[PDB]
Amino acid sequence: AAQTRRRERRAEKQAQWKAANPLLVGVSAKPVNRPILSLNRKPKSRVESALNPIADLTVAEYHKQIESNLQRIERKNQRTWYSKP
Amino acid sequence: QRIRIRLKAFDHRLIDQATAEIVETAKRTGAQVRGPIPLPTRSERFTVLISPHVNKDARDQYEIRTHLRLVDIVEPTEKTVDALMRLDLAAGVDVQISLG
Amino acid sequence: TPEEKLLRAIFGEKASDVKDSSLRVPNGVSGTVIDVQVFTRDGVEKDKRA
């Protein structure tokens, strides 16, 4: 806020450039604009299948079963069979 | 047993929406709904000048009226209480709840 | 390498776990085999076929 004052101190060095280059002005580059419109909305069907009361209590966590079933078999032959190949 | 729920709000759409959300939740989680009933709109005032000298502006001193409801529930399960726990209530509404 | 960690998430627990360092005949000597030894211990399942 306070600093960047030093380029407004150099406004004459800008003025000789505007005298030399009149067709150029202050510029602003331009990023990722294209998916920030589509991810701004479902509009409503995402909180219809998500539906702020009912579909966090009904559909809460569903890969929590598969992850407990996953490691426990390559764990299970070693912890089950025994260290004593 | 109760939980008892009493809600306070400034906007009527958020409290009608929110009570519809809580009653829909209590209907879906298998419990019974007691109420809800409304109560009178209590008015209030609090002078907020965001500006200098006192009353040269000739505009209102930011007055507002307040809506509030209440709803009860008897014999819930654990699905009800973690259901209302997982439910993200909106902001700008006050929740005066009970339990026992 | 991690590339054969990834395709040894595909092949096997014992598929590429081995590399050759077999005990051979020393350089220069060349004879015949006259005696072999058999020594095994009760626990870990002597092979068949065989």
Place this chain on the structure above:
Amino acid sequence: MNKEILAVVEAVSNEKALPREKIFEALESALATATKKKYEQEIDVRVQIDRKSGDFDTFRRWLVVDEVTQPTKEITLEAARYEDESLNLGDYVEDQIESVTFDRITTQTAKQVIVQKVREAERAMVVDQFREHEGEIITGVVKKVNRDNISLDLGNNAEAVILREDMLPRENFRPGDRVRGVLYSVRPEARGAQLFVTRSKPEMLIELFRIEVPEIGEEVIEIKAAARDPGSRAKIAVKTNDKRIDPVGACVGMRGARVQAVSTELGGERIDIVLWDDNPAQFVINAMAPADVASIVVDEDKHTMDIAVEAGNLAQAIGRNGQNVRLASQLSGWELNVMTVDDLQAKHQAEAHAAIDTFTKYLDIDEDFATVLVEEGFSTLEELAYVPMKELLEIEGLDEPTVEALRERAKNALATIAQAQQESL
């Protein structure tokens, strides 16, 4: 032998209510790949596996198309009508290959092709949660802080994570609290299930408006674009479906208050509620707020615009450190250039003499031509000299001949010079 791999693999399976119908295909692509290497031309095979007796029968597979591309592969349809008429174009005719045992060693490519299929099935149901909650607001209890990222607990030991640039720039953390987020765009990253929870991406602010404003859950108002700075300032664009509804008045509330509550949720987040227009030019005039726009020349074919502002509010039109011109150069979809009215005047005086000089590159007879350039421009060679009805009936006399002179010199000039310089080999 093995004779135990089927027992341990019916021990791993039926964990997501489908026991055998993934590992059918796992043994199909598993044993079908093994005979590719031992017979070295092109041999594609399929097996029929049965679980009851243990004996497995493989079957010869030949590709039925019309011509023979590479030899012996093609049954050449008229021969497929003889062995079984029910076999048609598109499927392969079954011939028996003699093999009946459990299998000879290898017997191990089975073991970690099973290890592969359980991991990608794990990936499938992790993608199934990644369908059920993208995008919601959910929140979790902090477990671990590993000095760049952090660990959450979303309930049933649902562990999540948050990056560094994915946060507000100065956040503090205590193990136990809960923070809300939208979730997210999927990386695996390694073999597991991680969930980057965001608070600095725009969808956090957007879904906070979705829970905060109930007219989004009623489809009364409609939000179009969102430009942010995760601790300083935001600009978000709304419209309404019915013209009587004010979406700005719906988004502010009483007294602040929706932008005040969602603002205090995200620190010192300034929120600009702005109306979306179907006009590309007027939505920028709304989006430069609180500036007072004098005039905008919209330049097509590059998505660029030029903005001039009168007096006093120049550093408020651009913003401190270019924030109004950057967020405004993020909301709309057209590049912005903010200047003065005198820099715009020198801009028109620069483009006029620039068009004159680029027409001095052409043949350029006497000063009356440049008077036509100042009066009627029509710059950049009249846009291929295609204008209607005598430049819409300008009067100097000279109805037929002189306009054919300027169109003749125009088309001949752009043809010769544009093929001389602009056209490449």
Place this chain on the structure above:
Amino acid sequence: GVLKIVKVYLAVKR
């Protein structure tokens, strides 16, 4: 290592 070690006597004609 893997797969085993066996003692083997070698007889070389000297």
Place this chain on the structure above:
RNA sequence: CAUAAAGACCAGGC
């Protein structure tokens, strides 16, 4: 191309 350690003690050749 990489692995069979290091150290102790004894026997042996001259």
Place this chain on the structure above:
RNA sequence: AUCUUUAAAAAUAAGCCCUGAAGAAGGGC
């Protein structure tokens, strides 16, 4: 306690200097 005419606008925050025309780019304390 027998008529009161189709619903309400918000930010006051980011330390000090050099190169550069830059509110493009980087450096220092």
